[PDB]
Amino acid sequence: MKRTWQPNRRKRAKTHGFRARMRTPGGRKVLKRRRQKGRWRLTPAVRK
Amino acid sequence: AKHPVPKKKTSKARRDARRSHHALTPPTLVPCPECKAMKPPHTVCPECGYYAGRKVLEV
Amino acid sequence: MRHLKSGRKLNRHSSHRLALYRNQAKSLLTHGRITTTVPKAKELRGFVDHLIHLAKRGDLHARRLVLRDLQDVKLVRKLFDEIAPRYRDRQGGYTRVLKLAERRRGDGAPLALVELVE
Amino acid sequence: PRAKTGVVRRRKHKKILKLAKGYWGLRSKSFRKARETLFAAGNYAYAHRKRRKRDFRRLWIVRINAACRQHGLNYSTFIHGLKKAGIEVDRKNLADLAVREPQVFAELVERAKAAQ
Amino acid sequence: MEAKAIARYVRISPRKVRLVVDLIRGKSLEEARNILRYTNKRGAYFVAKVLESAAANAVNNHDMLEDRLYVKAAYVDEGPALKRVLPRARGRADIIKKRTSHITVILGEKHG
RNA sequence: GGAUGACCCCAGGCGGUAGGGGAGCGUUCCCGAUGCCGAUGAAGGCCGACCCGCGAGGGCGGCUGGAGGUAAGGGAAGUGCGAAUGCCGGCAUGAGUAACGAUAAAGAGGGUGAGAAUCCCUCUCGCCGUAAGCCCAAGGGUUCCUACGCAAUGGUCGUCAG
RNA sequence: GUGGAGCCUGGGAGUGAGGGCGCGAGCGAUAACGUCCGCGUCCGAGCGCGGGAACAACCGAGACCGCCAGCUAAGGCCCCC
RNA sequence: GCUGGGGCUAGGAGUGAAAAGCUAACCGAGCCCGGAGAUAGCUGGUUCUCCCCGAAAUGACUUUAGGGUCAGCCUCAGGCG
RNA sequence: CGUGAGGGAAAGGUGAAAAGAACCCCGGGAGGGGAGUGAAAUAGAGCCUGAAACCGUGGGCUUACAAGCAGUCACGGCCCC
RNA sequence: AGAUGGUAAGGGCCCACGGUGGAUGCCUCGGCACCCGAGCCGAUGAAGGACGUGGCUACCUGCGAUAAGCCAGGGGG
Ligand SMILES: [Mg+2]
Ligand SMILES: [Mg+2]
Ligand SMILES: [Mg+2]
Ligand SMILES: [Mg+2]
Ligand SMILES: [Mg+2]
Ligand SMILES: [Mg+2]
Ligand SMILES: [Mg+2]
Ligand SMILES: [Mg+2]
Ligand SMILES: [Mg+2]
Ligand SMILES: [Mg+2]
Ligand SMILES: [Mg+2]
Ligand SMILES: [Mg+2]
Ligand SMILES: [Mg+2]
Ligand SMILES: [Mg+2]
Ligand SMILES: [Mg+2]
Ligand SMILES: [Mg+2]
Ligand SMILES: [Mg+2]
Ligand SMILES: [Mg+2]
Ligand SMILES: [Mg+2]
Ligand SMILES: [Mg+2]
Ligand SMILES: [Mg+2]
Ligand SMILES: [Mg+2]
Ligand SMILES: [Mg+2]
Ligand SMILES: [Mg+2]
Ligand SMILES: [Mg+2]
Ligand SMILES: [Mg+2]
Ligand SMILES: [Mg+2]
Ligand SMILES: [Mg+2]
Ligand SMILES: [Mg+2]
Ligand SMILES: [Mg+2]
Ligand SMILES: [Mg+2]
Ligand SMILES: [Mg+2]
Ligand SMILES: [Mg+2]
Ligand SMILES: [Mg+2]
Ligand SMILES: [Mg+2]
Ligand SMILES: [Mg+2]
Ligand SMILES: [Mg+2]
Ligand SMILES: [Mg+2]
Ligand SMILES: [Mg+2]
Ligand SMILES: [Mg+2]
Ligand SMILES: [Mg+2]
Ligand SMILES: [Mg+2]
Ligand SMILES: [Mg+2]
Ligand SMILES: [Mg+2]
Ligand SMILES: [Mg+2]
Ligand SMILES: [Mg+2]
Ligand SMILES: [Mg+2]
Ligand SMILES: [Mg+2]
Ligand SMILES: [Mg+2]
Ligand SMILES: [Mg+2]
Ligand SMILES: [Mg+2]
Ligand SMILES: [Mg+2]
Ligand SMILES: [Mg+2]
Ligand SMILES: [Mg+2]
Ligand SMILES: [Mg+2]
Ligand SMILES: [Mg+2]
Ligand SMILES: [Mg+2]
Ligand SMILES: [Mg+2]
Ligand SMILES: [Mg+2]
Ligand SMILES: [Mg+2]
Ligand SMILES: [Mg+2]
Ligand SMILES: [Mg+2]
Ligand SMILES: [Mg+2]
Ligand SMILES: [Mg+2]
Ligand SMILES: [Mg+2]
Ligand SMILES: [Mg+2]
Ligand SMILES: [Mg+2]
Ligand SMILES: [Mg+2]
Ligand SMILES: [Mg+2]
Ligand SMILES: [Mg+2]
Ligand SMILES: [Mg+2]
Ligand SMILES: [Mg+2]
Ligand SMILES: [Mg+2]
Ligand SMILES: [Mg+2]
Ligand SMILES: [Mg+2]
Ligand SMILES: [Mg+2]
Ligand SMILES: [Mg+2]
Ligand SMILES: [Mg+2]
Ligand SMILES: [Mg+2]
Ligand SMILES: [Mg+2]
Ligand SMILES: [Mg+2]
Ligand SMILES: [Mg+2]
Ligand SMILES: [Mg+2]
Ligand SMILES: [Mg+2]
Ligand SMILES: [Mg+2]
Ligand SMILES: [Mg+2]
Ligand SMILES: [Mg+2]
Ligand SMILES: [Mg+2]
Ligand SMILES: [Mg+2]
Ligand SMILES: [Mg+2]
Ligand SMILES: [Mg+2]
Ligand SMILES: [Mg+2]
Ligand SMILES: [Mg+2]
Ligand SMILES: [Mg+2]
Ligand SMILES: [Mg+2]
Ligand SMILES: [Mg+2]
Ligand SMILES: [Mg+2]
Ligand SMILES: [Mg+2]
Ligand SMILES: [Mg+2]
Ligand SMILES: [Mg+2]
Ligand SMILES: [Mg+2]
Ligand SMILES: [Mg+2]
Ligand SMILES: [Mg+2]
Ligand SMILES: [Mg+2]
Ligand SMILES: [Mg+2]
Ligand SMILES: [Mg+2]
Ligand SMILES: [Mg+2]
Ligand SMILES: [Mg+2]
Ligand SMILES: [Mg+2]
Ligand SMILES: [Mg+2]
Ligand SMILES: [Mg+2]
Ligand SMILES: [Mg+2]
Ligand SMILES: [Mg+2]
Ligand SMILES: [Mg+2]
Ligand SMILES: [Mg+2]
Ligand SMILES: [Mg+2]
Ligand SMILES: [Mg+2]
Ligand SMILES: [Mg+2]
Ligand SMILES: [Mg+2]
Ligand SMILES: [Mg+2]
Ligand SMILES: [Mg+2]
Ligand SMILES: [Mg+2]
Ligand SMILES: [Mg+2]
Ligand SMILES: [Mg+2]
Ligand SMILES: [Mg+2]
Ligand SMILES: [Mg+2]
Ligand SMILES: [Mg+2]
Ligand SMILES: [Mg+2]
Ligand SMILES: [Mg+2]
Ligand SMILES: [Mg+2]
Ligand SMILES: [Mg+2]
Ligand SMILES: [Mg+2]
Ligand SMILES: [Mg+2]
Ligand SMILES: [Mg+2]
Ligand SMILES: [Mg+2]
Ligand SMILES: [Mg+2]
Ligand SMILES: [Mg+2]
Ligand SMILES: [Mg+2]
Ligand SMILES: [Mg+2]
Ligand SMILES: [Mg+2]
Ligand SMILES: [Mg+2]
Ligand SMILES: [Mg+2]
Ligand SMILES: [Mg+2]
Ligand SMILES: [Mg+2]
Ligand SMILES: [Mg+2]
Ligand SMILES: [Mg+2]
Ligand SMILES: [Mg+2]
Ligand SMILES: [Mg+2]
Ligand SMILES: [Mg+2]
Ligand SMILES: [Mg+2]
Ligand SMILES: [Mg+2]
Ligand SMILES: [Mg+2]
Ligand SMILES: [Mg+2]
Ligand SMILES: [Mg+2]
Ligand SMILES: [Mg+2]
Ligand SMILES: [Mg+2]
Ligand SMILES: [Mg+2]
Ligand SMILES: [Mg+2]
Ligand SMILES: [Mg+2]
Ligand SMILES: [Mg+2]
Ligand SMILES: [Mg+2]
Ligand SMILES: [Mg+2]
Ligand SMILES: [Mg+2]
Ligand SMILES: [Mg+2]
Ligand SMILES: [Mg+2]
Ligand SMILES: [Mg+2]
Ligand SMILES: [Mg+2]
Ligand SMILES: [Mg+2]
Ligand SMILES: [Mg+2]
Ligand SMILES: [Mg+2]
Ligand SMILES: [Mg+2]
Ligand SMILES: [Mg+2]
Ligand SMILES: [Mg+2]
Ligand SMILES: [Mg+2]
Ligand SMILES: [Mg+2]
Ligand SMILES: [Mg+2]
Ligand SMILES: [Mg+2]
Ligand SMILES: [Mg+2]
Ligand SMILES: [Mg+2]
Ligand SMILES: [Mg+2]
Ligand SMILES: [Mg+2]
Ligand SMILES: [Mg+2]
Ligand SMILES: [Mg+2]
Ligand SMILES: [Mg+2]
Ligand SMILES: [Mg+2]
Ligand SMILES: [Mg+2]
Ligand SMILES: [Mg+2]
Ligand SMILES: [Mg+2]
Ligand SMILES: [Mg+2]
Ligand SMILES: [Mg+2]
Ligand SMILES: [Mg+2]
Ligand SMILES: [Mg+2]
Ligand SMILES: [Mg+2]
Ligand SMILES: [Mg+2]
Ligand SMILES: [Mg+2]
Ligand SMILES: [Mg+2]
Ligand SMILES: [Mg+2]
Ligand SMILES: [Mg+2]
Ligand SMILES: [Zn+2]
């Protein structure tokens, strides 16, 4: 049957993207937290 | 059914006892009257190609 | 049980089994000698002997009968004109089966050759 | 500082497993099972050290009895005579006499009949 | 004098090959060759190679005579197992052990 | 008894769960140590039917190992495991057992190759055909084409392959 | 009456589900391997030893270690024994 | 009526032709991280050796009754004798 | 691994020195046997030490009329010192 | 009529030697604690990144189309 993951490049970028995170105080804290942890990717990689 | 399951681990003795019937029987072979090579009986000899006196097959 | 029952099943349904025999017949009559599994081989003898025996008749009826299984006019021409004649004085037994010594690698199947007799 | 297990536990298990040589299956190969088997073994040895003394005395008595009835009395009567005679040779030696030195045993029997 | 060959890390399960090995232990090189040739087992292929390599070692390196060689000793040891995943129902994942053999053949000389 | 813990003599006590008390063994570390043991072999490992200790243990001997170890007397603790449906790892049992993923289906001949039911070619047979054919868009991201390969991936095989 | 008696002052507890049996009662049905008290006992903790065929609490008896020595206890002495 | 694409509404909140249904395969109150080693009068588990002693499962009170405080019973030190 | 916030591993050691095994032999290869290096190669790269569970080969004793928590006590047979 | 042996398909105990596996000892390129030193960066575009950059270059490091580097001072030999 239809499962839960239904890939969409637009949806992905608009939801979890860098610009989306910078718009919101909570999203900026995500970027802060991940940078401090030393994540190689602050934001879900996606192709456009 | 209700999923039967082994109640106790089989001992090394009991596992090996089961396998007391597992030994291979060696292949039964006979000499080919033409080339004296060893081959299973009632088969065309795979070495010279002879069976029942005559050449039957190209080896 | 299986009491006094004749005929292998060879793990095929009715129409597949028929095809199997018909195809093996075409191949045997074509090359004079083929290699199969022992069971297929032992079962092919009767099927082909009958076809040969009908070619020995020669008439139109026999030709159209054999044509039901062999289906190929040229192959049947070969049957009547070149194969059948050399068995004019032979009373059945137009085929022989001899077993090979080596089994198939991939499944251990014992093999045998089936050939038309001299 | 830190005192990790290190060498100690292996050595302790090794001690037990050695004591368990000859045992069946895991009872000689698995520490846990060996230790359990050894508990039983230790109690048996203690208890059977105690019963060995019973076991032999019982055997001696059976043997003395056989030797007595050859001379027309039973063990009970024989021992009572010996008591009245004041012959304090124990049942270990009495049984030995009965087999090895029948003439001496025959003599002792007479003494026992007489003391009656 | 003895000659040995080992085939290490053979991708076959020990319990299987040993069946084949057991057939040739103690036998003459010639009989061992004939047996393996008509033994309907995958293992026959591997055991035969070790046999033949050991025979070569005997003749070429150890000054032993081919016409006198017999299988003095043979055995199979377990090598490291290749662990692989077998997917089952209801999201459960099992582990298949694709096992491995170390095959050893030791040849001696049958005098007299 | 002798002089006090030397050892001897006589006598009595000495089942034991919760629990109280006492005396010891071993582990890591510090002073002892600018020392001492050590390649004529450290620690660790594997044996021992030997010695000492009630015991925990401590010696000694042989093999392994190949660079550390550490006394008498004291000091300090991440100090002793058999169980926690404990944790991590390794390996067993079930077992050569169930299974190898739609019952659309196969057979032969000829190539290749160390090796072929499984790769290539040919003939015969079967299945789909509002599809199991073709063309887009999502998504996937070199999977495309050719050469050279078969350890692993492929539920078998493999010379073939996403 | 010198005993792992007793008293006094302190340190540390554990226990605060008991159970069977005997005797004396209540409850129950002059029932329960029942329930609730009293006196004692044993098991608990003596599932260590002998007897009771086997069997925590019935009979015998309180196991520091060793002995191929002796006497007994309950219970036994036709064979198993 | 079904359906693609683009959007909006969420945790005591959303959405619901109402089943406490659904809100990323467990929703009578989502998930992640944090408070956090919450708390657990409950269950489990608790590691070397030898030596001496050695209980209790009762009473009173207890939102107490399978938990406690005091007493009783065990042990150690000093004192009395 | 998770849409995401977020969760989050495993995995060190040849030898003094690569001197990391020319060349030959069996093999398609892998692997091995000689040769060679080294104080040492069961230090050979799947490399220091190399315990245990687990699997196997060889040898000693033993087992197909026997009743079991697998031991213990006694005696006898065989094998070894 | 009597009695007593060798059998091992296989199993068990012990011994030897292996395989597997990676405990233990030794080791330390790492970590932990305390103490002391030191303490802001950014529109002159930071922190942190993307894509690039080598004769042959997967990754890491370095660097930025002047790209494992350009200029000058100092050190060093
Ligand atoms: Mg459906
Ligand atoms: Mg649908
Ligand atoms: Mg996903
Ligand atoms: Mg998923
Ligand atoms: Mg959709
Ligand atoms: Mg899109
Ligand atoms: Mg969208
Ligand atoms: Mg965005
Ligand atoms: Mg701000
Ligand atoms: Mg955000
Ligand atoms: Mg990541
Ligand atoms: Mg990065
Ligand atoms: Mg993000
Ligand atoms: Mg059903
Ligand atoms: Mg089982
Ligand atoms: Mg078992
Ligand atoms: Mg077991
Ligand atoms: Mg079983
Ligand atoms: Mg075995
Ligand atoms: Mg012939
Ligand atoms: Mg039927
Ligand atoms: Mg018939
Ligand atoms: Mg039939
Ligand atoms: Mg038919
Ligand atoms: Mg078939
Ligand atoms: Mg079938
Ligand atoms: Mg049909
Ligand atoms: Mg028809
Ligand atoms: Mg031809
Ligand atoms: Mg037809
Ligand atoms: Mg055949
Ligand atoms: Mg064959
Ligand atoms: Mg195959
Ligand atoms: Mg055959
Ligand atoms: Mg520990
Ligand atoms: Mg043992
Ligand atoms: Mg034994
Ligand atoms: Mg004991
Ligand atoms: Mg005793
Ligand atoms: Mg005695
Ligand atoms: Mg006695
Ligand atoms: Mg008397
Ligand atoms: Mg007397
Ligand atoms: Mg005599
Ligand atoms: Mg096999
Ligand atoms: Mg075996
Ligand atoms: Mg065979
Ligand atoms: Mg040769
Ligand atoms: Mg499945
Ligand atoms: Mg699924
Ligand atoms: Mg398993
Ligand atoms: Mg497995
Ligand atoms: Mg394996
Ligand atoms: Mg005394
Ligand atoms: Mg005392
Ligand atoms: Mg006493
Ligand atoms: Mg005591
Ligand atoms: Mg210790
Ligand atoms: Mg000091
Ligand atoms: Mg020093
Ligand atoms: Mg010196
Ligand atoms: Mg040495
Ligand atoms: Mg140390
Ligand atoms: Mg030490
Ligand atoms: Mg000792
Ligand atoms: Mg010792
Ligand atoms: Mg020593
Ligand atoms: Mg040593
Ligand atoms: Mg040495
Ligand atoms: Mg040094
Ligand atoms: Mg402490
Ligand atoms: Mg600790
Ligand atoms: Mg414990
Ligand atoms: Mg379970
Ligand atoms: Mg269970
Ligand atoms: Mg747990
Ligand atoms: Mg554990
Ligand atoms: Mg596990
Ligand atoms: Mg089977
Ligand atoms: Mg079964
Ligand atoms: Mg079955
Ligand atoms: Mg099946
Ligand atoms: Mg399938
Ligand atoms: Mg399946
Ligand atoms: Mg199928
Ligand atoms: Mg089918
Ligand atoms: Mg072909
Ligand atoms: Mg060619
Ligand atoms: Mg060819
Ligand atoms: Mg193939
Ligand atoms: Mg092939
Ligand atoms: Mg073909
Ligand atoms: Mg197929
Ligand atoms: Mg149709
Ligand atoms: Mg149509
Ligand atoms: Mg249709
Ligand atoms: Mg696209
Ligand atoms: Mg993908
Ligand atoms: Mg081209
Ligand atoms: Mg492959
Ligand atoms: Mg392959
Ligand atoms: Mg292959
Ligand atoms: Mg390759
Ligand atoms: Mg495969
Ligand atoms: Mg598959
Ligand atoms: Mg190709
Ligand atoms: Mg392709
Ligand atoms: Mg008094
Ligand atoms: Mg007292
Ligand atoms: Mg008292
Ligand atoms: Mg007091
Ligand atoms: Mg007190
Ligand atoms: Mg205290
Ligand atoms: Mg309490
Ligand atoms: Mg209470
Ligand atoms: Mg109470
Ligand atoms: Mg009560
Ligand atoms: Mg009461
Ligand atoms: Mg009481
Ligand atoms: Mg009772
Ligand atoms: Mg009375
Ligand atoms: Mg009454
Ligand atoms: Mg009553
Ligand atoms: Mg009553
Ligand atoms: Mg009472
Ligand atoms: Mg209790
Ligand atoms: Mg009792
Ligand atoms: Mg008492
Ligand atoms: Mg009982
Ligand atoms: Mg009793
Ligand atoms: Mg009794
Ligand atoms: Mg008496
Ligand atoms: Mg009496
Ligand atoms: Mg009487
Ligand atoms: Mg009697
Ligand atoms: Mg719409
Ligand atoms: Mg829509
Ligand atoms: Mg959308
Ligand atoms: Mg909520
Ligand atoms: Mg919340
Ligand atoms: Mg609401
Ligand atoms: Mg989720
Ligand atoms: Mg859901
Ligand atoms: Mg709630
Ligand atoms: Mg959910
Ligand atoms: Mg947070
Ligand atoms: Mg708090
Ligand atoms: Mg609370
Ligand atoms: Mg006492
Ligand atoms: Mg009370
Ligand atoms: Mg009461
Ligand atoms: Mg109140
Ligand atoms: Mg209550
Ligand atoms: Mg409570
Ligand atoms: Mg109190
Ligand atoms: Mg006092
Ligand atoms: Mg006093
Ligand atoms: Mg995912
Ligand atoms: Mg992802
Ligand atoms: Mg290593
Ligand atoms: Mg080195
Ligand atoms: Mg080095
Ligand atoms: Mg070659
Ligand atoms: Mg060659
Ligand atoms: Mg090839
Ligand atoms: Mg090579
Ligand atoms: Mg080599
Ligand atoms: Mg040399
Ligand atoms: Mg040298
Ligand atoms: Mg030396
Ligand atoms: Mg070598
Ligand atoms: Mg070595
Ligand atoms: Mg070594
Ligand atoms: Mg070494
Ligand atoms: Mg070293
Ligand atoms: Mg090693
Ligand atoms: Mg190893
Ligand atoms: Mg080992
Ligand atoms: Mg053996
Ligand atoms: Mg009988
Ligand atoms: Mg017998
Ligand atoms: Mg028996
Ligand atoms: Mg029993
Ligand atoms: Mg016995
Ligand atoms: Mg006796
Ligand atoms: Mg006999
Ligand atoms: Mg045997
Ligand atoms: Mg056998
Ligand atoms: Mg080993
Ligand atoms: Mg290893
Ligand atoms: Mg150290
Ligand atoms: Mg440091
Ligand atoms: Mg400052
Ligand atoms: Mg930057
Ligand atoms: Mg770079
Ligand atoms: Mg410059
Ligand atoms: Mg410069
Ligand atoms: Mg300069
Ligand atoms: Zn021939």
UniProtKB/Swiss-Prot annotation, chain A:
GO terms for molecular function: structural constituent of ribosome. The lineage of its organism: Bacteria, Thermotogati, Deinococcota, Deinococci, Thermales. This is Large ribosomal subunit protein bL34. Residues 29-48 have a biased composition (Basic residues). Belongs to the bacterial ribosomal protein bL34 family. Part of the 50S ribosomal subunit. Transmembrane segments: none annotated. Keywords: Ribonucleoprotein, Ribosomal protein. The open reading frame (ORF) for this protein is entirely within the ORF for the RNase P protein (RnaP). The two start codons are separated by four nucleotides. One of its GO terms (biological process) is translation. It comes from Thermus thermophilus (strain ATCC 27634 / DSM 579 / HB8). The gene is rpmH.
UniProtKB/Swiss-Prot annotation, chain B:
Residues 1-29 are annotated as: Disordered. Keywords: Ribonucleoprotein, Ribosomal protein. Gene3D superfamilies: Single helix bin (1.20.5.640). The keyword Protein transport does not apply. Pfam families: Ribosomal_L32p (PF01783). It comes from the Bacteria. GO terms for cellular component: large ribosomal subunit. Part of the 50S ribosomal subunit. Found on the solvent side of the large subunit. This is Large ribosomal subunit protein bL32.
From Swiss-Prot, chain D:
One of its GO terms (cellular component) is ribonucleoprotein complex. The keyword RNA-binding applies. It comes from the Bacteria. Keywords: Ribonucleoprotein, Ribosomal protein, RNA-binding, rRNA-binding. GO terms for biological process: ribosomal large subunit assembly; translation. One of its GO terms (molecular function) is rRNA binding. InterPro entries: Ribosomal_bL20 (IPR005813), RIBOSOMAL_L20_CS (IPR049946), Ribosomal_protein_bL20_C (IPR035566). CDD domains: Ribosomal_L20. Pfam families: Ribosomal_L20. The keyword NAD does not apply. Signal peptide: none annotated. Belongs to the bacterial ribosomal protein bL20 family. Binds directly to 23S ribosomal RNA and is necessary for the in vitro assembly process of the 50S ribosomal subunit. It is not involved in the protein synthesizing functions of that subunit. This is Large ribosomal subunit protein bL20.
Curated annotation (Swiss-Prot), chain E:
InterPro entries: Ribosomal_uL22 (IPR001063), Ribosomal_uL22_bac/chlpt-type (IPR005727), Ribosomal_uL22_bac/org-type (IPR047867), Ribosomal_uL22_CS (IPR018260), Ribosomal_uL22_sf (IPR036394). One of its GO terms (molecular function) is structural constituent of ribosome. SUPFAM superfamilies: Ribosomal protein L22. GO terms for biological process: translation. The keyword rRNA-binding applies. One of its GO terms (cellular component) is cytosolic large ribosomal subunit. Coiled coil: none annotated. Pfam families: Ribosomal_L22. Keywords: Ribonucleoprotein, Ribosomal protein, RNA-binding, rRNA-binding. Part of the 50S ribosomal subunit. HAMAP family: Ribosomal_uL22_B (MF_01331_B). PANTHER family: CHLOROPLAST 50S RIBOSOMAL PROTEIN L22-RELATED, LARGE RIBOSOMAL SUBUNIT PROTEIN UL22M. This protein binds specifically to 23S rRNA; its binding is stimulated by other ribosomal proteins, e.g. L4, L17, and L20. It is important during the early stages of 50S assembly. It makes multiple contacts with different domains of the 23S rRNA in the assembled 50S subunit and ribosome. The globular domain of the protein is one of the proteins that surrounds the polypeptide exit tunnel on the outside of the subunit, while an extended beta-hairpin is found that penetrates into the center of the 70S ribosome. This extension seems to form part of the wall of the exit tunnel. Belongs to the universal ribosomal protein uL22 family. This is Large ribosomal subunit protein uL22. The lineage of its organism: Bacteria, Thermotogati, Deinococcota, Deinococci, Thermales. The gene is rplV.
